[PDB]
Amino acid sequence: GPMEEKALIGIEDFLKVDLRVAKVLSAERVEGSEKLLKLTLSLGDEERTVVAGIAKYYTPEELVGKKIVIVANLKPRKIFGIESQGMILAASDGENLSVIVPDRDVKEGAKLS
Amino acid sequence: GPMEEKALIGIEDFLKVDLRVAKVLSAERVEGSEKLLKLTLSLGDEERTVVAGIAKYYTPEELVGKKIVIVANLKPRKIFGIESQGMILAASDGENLSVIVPDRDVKEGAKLS
């Protein structure tokens, strides 16, 4: 369940996920939508387009040029006529929303798993 | 395998892992080990003890008081006599290691999944 408490998992279930560091090359508004943002991200040797519902929480000024953590091995989908592959990590406390960045300026493409 | 290319996954496999923001309360060294630090982490309403092999890259001083992303629902294990339950997110690029923090200040225990 999306709102349920998550039972204990082994390291395998974590290793199934491909967490990576990606540099936001650009973040533009999605036409016909006030909540979506189309973000191009560099993973070092490959680029990725991700549609994220964070337009009300993040302006593109506070995103472009930053290194953020993403899930790279999500199956591709069609969001508002845009081919989006993967998704961004985002933490909420019920009040604010925040993207997820590395503590030190690690290079783009750095893996977490 | 850890060095293998990870196949594409559905979002359920991601939702199965419990990624949370936790505040580092303390960070001490582990007796008999030169690589491991024992960190206590506040999740707002509950605490966690995690042993991490990052002493080569992080001193206690550059960790305590920070908000870092962790996997909170990992099965517990006895590491060097310490009961550790949970794992800290860490990004590496073959040259530098970095813990993972929220871009914006979010309340401890903030849910990412």
Numbering used by the authors:
A (entry chain B), B (entry chain A): -1 to 111
How is this structure described in the published paper?
Across all domains of life, a widespread class of OB folds have specialized to recognize and manipulate tRNAs, perform key functions in tRNA trafficking and metabolism, and are designated as the tRNA binding domain (TRBD) superfamily (IPR002547; PF01588). In bacteria, Aquifex aeolicus Trbp111 (tRNA-binding protein, 111 amino acids) and Escherichia coli Trbp exemplify the free-standing, dimeric OB-fold proteins that bind diverse tRNA species. Trbp has been suggested to facilitate the folding of the tRNA structure by binding its characteristic elbow region formed by the intercalation of the D-loop into the T-loop and was observed to enhance aminoacylation by several aminoacyl-tRNA synthetases (aaRSs). Contrary to previous proposals, Trbp111 does not recognize the global tRNA structure nor its elbow or anticodon but solely binds its universal 3′ terminal single-stranded CA dinucleotide with a strong positional, structural, and sequence preference.
As described, Trbp111 forms a homodimer where each protomer adopts a canonical OB-fold architecture resembling the Greek key motif, in which five β-strands assemble into two three-stranded β-sheets which are joined to form a β-barrel. The core OB-fold comprises residues 16–89, with the flanking N-terminal (1–15) and C-terminal (90–111) residues of each protomer interacting in an antiparallel manner, forming a central interfacial region. The interface involves an extensive network of hydrogen bonds, salt bridges, hydrophobic interactions, aromatic stacking, and cation-π interactions, altogether burying ~ 1955 Å2 of solvent-accessible surfaces. These contacts produce an unusually robust dimer interface (theoretical ΔG ~ − 22.5 kcal/mol, Kd ~ 3.1 × 10−17 M) that resists denaturation by heat, SDS, Urea, or guanidine treatments. Full denaturation was only achieved when combining heat denaturation and 6 M guanidine treatment. This compact, ultra-stable protein-protein interface is consistent with the hyperthermophilic nature of A. aeolicus, which grows at 85–95 °C. Its resistance to heat and chemical insults is in line with proposed functions as chaperones that may aid the folding of other proteins (e.g., CsaA) or tRNAs (e.g., Trbp). Our Trbp111 apo structure superposes very well with the complex (RMSD ~ 0.6 Å), with key side chains occupying nearly identical positions. Therefore, Trbp111 is pre-organized to capture the terminal CA dinucleotide of tRNAs.
